Amino acid sequence: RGSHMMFVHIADNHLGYRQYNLDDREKDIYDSFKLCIKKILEIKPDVVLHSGDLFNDLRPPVKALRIAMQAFKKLHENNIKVYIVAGNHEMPRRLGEESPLALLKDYVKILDGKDVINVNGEEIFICGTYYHKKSKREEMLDKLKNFESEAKNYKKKILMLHQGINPYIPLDYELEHFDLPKFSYYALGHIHKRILERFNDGILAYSGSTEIIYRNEYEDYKKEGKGFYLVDFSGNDLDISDIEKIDIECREFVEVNIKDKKSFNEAVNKIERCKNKPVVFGKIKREFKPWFDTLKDKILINKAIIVDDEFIDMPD
Ligand SMILES: [Mn+2]
Numbered sequence: 001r002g003s004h005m006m007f008v009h010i011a012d013n014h015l016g017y018r019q020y021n022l023d024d025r026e027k028d029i030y031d032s033f034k035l036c037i038k039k040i041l042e043i044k045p046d047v048v049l050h051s052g053d054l055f056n057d058l059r060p061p062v063k064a065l066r067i068a069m070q071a072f073k074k075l076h077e078n079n080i081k082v083y084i085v086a087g088n089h090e091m092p093r094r095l096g097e098e099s100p101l102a103l104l105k106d107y108v109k110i111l112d113g114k115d116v117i118n119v120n121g122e123e124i125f126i127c128g129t130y131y132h133k134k135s136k137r138e139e140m141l142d143k144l145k146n147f148e149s150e151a152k153n154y155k156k157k158i159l160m161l162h163q164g165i166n167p168y169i170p171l172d173y174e175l176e177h178f179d180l181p182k183f184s185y186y187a188l189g190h191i192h193k194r195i196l197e198r199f200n201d202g203i204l205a206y207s208g209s210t211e212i213i214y215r216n217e218y219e220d221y222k223k224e225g226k227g228f229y230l231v232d233f234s235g236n237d238l239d240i241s242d243i244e245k246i247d248i249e250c251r252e253f254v255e256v257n258i259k260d261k262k263s264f265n266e267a268v269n270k271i272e273r274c275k276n277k278p279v280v281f282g283k284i285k286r287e288f289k290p291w292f293d294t295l296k297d298k299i300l301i302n303k304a305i306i307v308d309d310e311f312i313d314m315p316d
């Protein structure tokens with residue numbers, strides 16, 4: 001709970017992303033979003049920190065754009081200052097082309113340098129910048145030293161970035177853990193998975209994506225949770241213990257592995273238990289495919305793999 005000062009660190013929503021070309025997948029993304037926004041409007045943090053990739057394209061579907069203005073307009077009418085850094089998907093490619101973030105200019109401040117927020121009441125230091133490509137790594141080194149210099153005489157200092165770091169995204173990454181200065185809090189984004197762990201005299205954060213945009217984020221979803229992280233900075237120091245990570249419910253995926261009767265019955269009991277039609281993935285032996293075709297109507301989509309091979313490898 002709390003507090004005296006508080007704020008949210010969310011990232012990666014990918015509004016307008018129509019997975020498996022499913023009209024219905026498009027929708028779920030806006031829902032997890034519209035959801036997150038609802039939590040945050042309750043919690044009323046004094047400021048919000050969006051580590052980028054709010055959108056999923058330089059020219060989003062109109063609805064994604066509207067939902068995102070309506071959202072942040074609400075946030076801003078409710079006296080909550082928002083900072084957002086530009087992710088890869090929000091960076092213009094041709095000279096003069098404009099991000100789709102440049103539609104949230106009135107509700108949101110885009111970080112590309114340094115600023116200090118008086119809050120109520122106190123003083124803290126934000127710096128962050130947009131998404132630079134692996135190549136522009138050098139460009140950035142300077143960017144951070146500069147940042148560091150103006151950040152030293154400042155007790156509480158926050159860093160916003162949308163990039164692949166090296167201890168965290170083995171390939172491909174654009175920065176090294178040893179590339180970046182020492183800050184109270186590292187509000188990053190671009191890693192679609194919740195990653196809160198202390199770091200160089202402060203705490204690093206990877207809000208994570210707000211809905212299973214892969215193709216991986218399965219177990220990560222269920223064990224940890226997708227959504228944002230709620231920080232507060234009411235108190236001097238900060239440990240993993242003053243960061244209340246909020247979870248956000250979404251479309252249920254079920255992993256199947258269908259190879260005997262045991263596991264074909266398993267995969268169904270899991271799909272009964274499902275509150276909503278699920279996206280189902282994993283493997284299904286070819287021989288059971290058409291038996292499982294039997295649940296077409298209880299299932300949003302079947303993105304499991306059909307296995308034509310026969311396996312002997314038992315368990316020990
Ligand atoms: Mn992303």
Ligand SMILES: [Mn+2]
Nearest residue numbers: 053087088190
């Ligand atoms: Mn990204």
